[PDB]
Amino acid sequence: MSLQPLTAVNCGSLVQPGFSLLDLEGDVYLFGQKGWPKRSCPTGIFGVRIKKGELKLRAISFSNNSSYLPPLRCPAIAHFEAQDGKPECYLIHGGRTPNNELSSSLYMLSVDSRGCNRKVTLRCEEKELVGDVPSARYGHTLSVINSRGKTACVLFGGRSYMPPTERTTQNWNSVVDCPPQVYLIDLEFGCCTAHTLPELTDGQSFHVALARQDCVYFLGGHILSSDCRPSRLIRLHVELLLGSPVLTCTILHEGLTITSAIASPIGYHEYIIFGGYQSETQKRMECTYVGLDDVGVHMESREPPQWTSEISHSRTWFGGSLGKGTALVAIPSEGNPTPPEAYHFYQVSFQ
């Protein structure tokens, strides 16, 4: 366990409080640029490389085949790994664009060509969704499941803007938890099924999802109605049998109280959960290790890296996981005259 300081070198004005790191085929790509894309990099996505403490961002270039994407802030990212037909995909839906609206449109992001010289072209394929469309939402999570042997996806959680009845230009900027109905989205075709369960009383937000072998575990998120941070861990088990994707669920005894957590995969399916917060005021310093098996998910705290007094005293913090037991954290910084760079960074690593 260790952490070391990172200088953001040039162009540290690109990172906004929510954002997303896409780890695919080695190098990871930053996503969710602040504001609208500037033609310095019109694409909107950045390859990120960390060398000798320096954090450098490179300008990715989409393939001609691709649709272009707005810098969504806090979407549901679901990594789908390599298999037929076309690996490997990152499912981004739907976040909210630099203007205030919620996309509610799934995008499939994939690698294309390399290099020639250390160059990676990418392609985004938006997919049409018929339904029973998912309601526009953000902070929700999405996951990839495989049942005998068909692959589908599970979409749940998240806030949305108040429905267009209660909607009022005084209450316009308010949000509310969208109702608790899980959406099963086939990758292809675009059929989106909406089911509900009695076990799910309420909707959640920022609940970190773990997904393995036709089973999905939602950690305790943030419920906006009763303002609780449930220590109840949620499990669900789906199996797709012709012609219906039958679905079940169970509550668990013990689950974590943390919201906005960062899951960095280390082992086969074993993740290290950093967590963003214990409660509304006070962030979580504690680092936790979470593995999962067919029997169940098993929790073991490991000794957290010794935090510099700054990050221990910082009100807010965030980041992403570069994968391979390696992650990035970010600390907002007040200084005058403006640094200008708003965020100090630290790279964290396990073992």
Binding site: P5, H313, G335, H344
Partner: protein
């Protein structure tokens, strides 16, 4: 317009005896262009500066003629018979001169002038009496709130860069000349119906350290010789702190320059600068060997801010900190001072953020940051020491308001310096900020001598600068020629007591 003709200078009749040296006898002169007869020939050193000034003496007699009311009510209160014993007065005038940046030039006609503006002012601190003989001197009127911008009397208004000496002395030359010519002669005014006589005692106390240094010919501002009041070098004031004796005074600096120039002993530059203890230039103005309260506060506040910054990380543990960590320490320190104490970072630190920072409960939010326990106790203890010695030089008159802190100040400073050279030495080995030395050395002495300090602070000047900005917009003419004229006039009117009396509305 014809109503204030009285309140301005160049109205009330007065005369000096014996007659002033090198000054005209005409008492009707109002606002005068301060260039004061520069021939403005192209061939000569150009006149790039606009200024306006009252002839010093006239401004004085108007100020005091305006204090006529308060000194008569004061005299009556004393039940000292008004008509008899009228000639023995003593007037103590605090004068102050400070510069101001970032004042934008006007398109205007001419001439070309720099952006920075210098405001030369004064205030009447007290007026007392002595005769028949016998008893002491006897206070009558004493300014109750000297720091207020309500009483600061502007005199010379200029557009001059503080840095160029040539022009600054060119315009302020006449003013100083009337002062040192005036100290000798006693004033005669017709007041309360009768002809009475005043002695004037001038104390310039309001100048900032850099200006004191630059008019006194010293090397500013970080030179090896720190004390304006003492001959101590940097490193010598490092080892020893709390024990010092004030030496530097005007006449001595003059003689010291004449040595520096004439150089009878023929030492090399290094050794010569050692012999005169760092007087490289002939001072012109005379300045009381006293300490500005305001800048002192800000100096110590910024030093403690730096100490905080160093205690957040561990400096004495690793002596050679990286730059990136230097900013990281600043970032978490100001984070803290936001979350607690409700404070936000500053570029230059105003004295207000110095008053929030200096308090103990402010040192509480930082005490939580430093991991080490005994360090946490050390700087806390330091700060309480500082709270104990601060009101001495901050308060107007400590001889009454805060006696016990005053009597214990020497011992308290001893304790302080000990604690610094004890746990903090790494940051004070060969270097001490000018003010920490000045406040740990010469304070008890000057409080013993002036009777009090902080009443003499630059604050009563400085504040006034605010007005100079608004009076340069609201009440300006506005063109480059007349502008200083009507700012100056309107300022004078703002300062007068006679009006404020009315604006009290008698409860």
């Amino acid at each position: 317009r014809n109503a204030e003709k009285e309140l301005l200078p160049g109205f009330h009749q007065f005369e000096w005896q014996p007659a002033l040296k090198n000054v005209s006898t005409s008492w009707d002169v109002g606002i005068i262009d301060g260039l004061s007869g520069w021939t403005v020939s192209v061939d000569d050193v150009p006149a790039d500066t606009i200024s306006r000034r009252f002839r010093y003496d006239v401004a004085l007699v108007s100020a005091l003629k305006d204090l006529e009311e308060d000194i008569m009510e004061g005299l009556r209160e004393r039940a000292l018979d008004d008509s008899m014993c009228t000639s023995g007065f003593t007037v103590v005038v605090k004068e102050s001169c400070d510069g101001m940046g970032d004042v934008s030039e006007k398109h205007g006609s001419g001439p070309a002038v720099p952006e920075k503006a210098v405001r030369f002012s004064f205030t009447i601190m007290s007026i007392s009496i002595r005769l028949e003989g016998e008893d002491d001197g006897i206070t009558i009127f004493q300014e109750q709130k000297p720091n207020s911008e309500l009483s600061c009397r502007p005199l010379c208004l200029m557009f001059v860069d503080e840095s160029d000496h040539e022009t600054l002395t060119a315009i302020l030359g006449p003013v100083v000349a009337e002062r040192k010519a005036m100290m000798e002669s006693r004033l005669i005014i017709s007041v309360g119906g009768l002809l009475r006589s005043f002695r004037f005692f001038f104390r310039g106390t309001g100048y900032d350290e850099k200006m004191v240094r630059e008019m006194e010919g010293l090397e500013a501002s970080g030179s090896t010789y720190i004390c304006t009041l003492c001959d101590s070098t940097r490193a010598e004031a490092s080892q020893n702190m709390v024990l010092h004796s004030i030496t530097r005074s005007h006449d001595e600096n003059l003689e010291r320059y004449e040595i520096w120039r004439k150089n009878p002993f023929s030492e090399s530059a290094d050794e010569l600068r050692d012999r005169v203890k760092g007087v490289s230039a002939k001072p012109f103005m005379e300045t009381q060997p006293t300490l500005d309260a305001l800048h002192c506060d800000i100096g110590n506040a910024t030093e403690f801010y730096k100490i905080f910054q160093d205690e957040i990380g561990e400096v004495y543990q690793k002596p050679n900190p990286s730059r990136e960590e230097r900013r990281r320490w600043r970032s978490t320190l100001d984070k803290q001072l936001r979350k607690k104490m409700k404070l936000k970072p500053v570029m230059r630190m105003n004295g207000n953020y110095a008053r929030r920072l200096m308090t103990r409960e402010a040192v509480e939010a930082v005490c939580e940051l430093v991991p080490s326990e005994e360090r946490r106790e050390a700087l806390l203890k330091l700060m309480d020491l500082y709270l104990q010695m601060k009101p001495v030089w901050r308060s107007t008159c400590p001889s009454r308001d805060c006696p016990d802190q005053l009597c214990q100040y020497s011992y308290n400073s001893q304790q302080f310096a000990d604690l610094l050279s004890s746990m903090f030495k790494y940051r004070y080995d060969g270097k001490i900020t000018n003010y920490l030395h000045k406040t740990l050395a010469h304070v008890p002495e000057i409080v013993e001598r002036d009777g009090s300090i902080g009443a003499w602070a630059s604050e009563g000047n400085e504040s006034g600068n605010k007005l100079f900005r608004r009076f340069r917009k609201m009440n300006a003419r506005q063109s480059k020629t007349f502008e200083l004229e009507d700012i100056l006039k309107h300022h004078w009117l703002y300062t007068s007591k006679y009006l404020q009396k009315f604006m009290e509305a008698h409860k």
